[PDB]
Structure 1
Amino acid sequence: PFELSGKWITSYIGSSDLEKIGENAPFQVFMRSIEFDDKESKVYLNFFSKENGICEEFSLIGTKQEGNTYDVNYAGNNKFVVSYASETALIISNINVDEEGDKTIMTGLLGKGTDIEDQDLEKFKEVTRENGIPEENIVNIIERDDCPA
Structure 2
Amino acid sequence: FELSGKWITSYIGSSDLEKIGENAPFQVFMRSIEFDDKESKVYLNFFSKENGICEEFSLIGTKQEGNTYDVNYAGNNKFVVSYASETALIISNINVDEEGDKTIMTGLLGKGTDIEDQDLEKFKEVTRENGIPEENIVNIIERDDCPA
Asked if residue 130 in structure 1 is aligned to residue 129 in structure 2, the reply is yes
Q: What stretches of structure 2 of length at least 5 have no aligned partner?
A: none
TM-score calculated relative to the size of structure 2: 1.00
Q: Report Cα offsets for 1:47-92 as digits up to 9, x if no partner.
A: 0000000000000000000111000000000000000000000000
| Alignment partner, residue 37 of structure 2 | 38
Which whole-Å CA distance do the structure 2 matches of 1:5 and 1:57 have between them?
Answer: 19
Q: Report Cα offsets for 1:85-106 as digits up to 9, x if no partner.
A: 0000000000000000000000
Which whole-Å CA distance do the structure 2 matches of 1:50 and 1:98 have between them?
Answer: 18
| Alignment partner, residue 97 of structure 1 | 96
Q: Report Cα offsets for 1:90-144 as digits up to 9, x if no partner.
A: 0000000000000000000000010000000000000000000000000000000
Which whole-Å CA distance do the structure 1 matches of 2:11 and 2:78 have between them?
Answer: 19
Moved over 3 A (4+): none
| Alignment partner, residue 87 of structure 1 | 86
TM-score calculated relative to the size of structure 1: 0.99
Deviation, 1:3, is 1.1
How many residues matched? 148
* Structure with higher helix content: 2
Q: What stretches of structure 1 of length at least 5 have no aligned partner?
A: none
SS at match of 1:67: helix
Which whole-Å CA distance do the structure 1 matches of 2:2 and 2:65 have between them?
Answer: 21
Which whole-Å CA distance do the structure 1 matches of 2:2 and 2:103 have between them?
Answer: 29
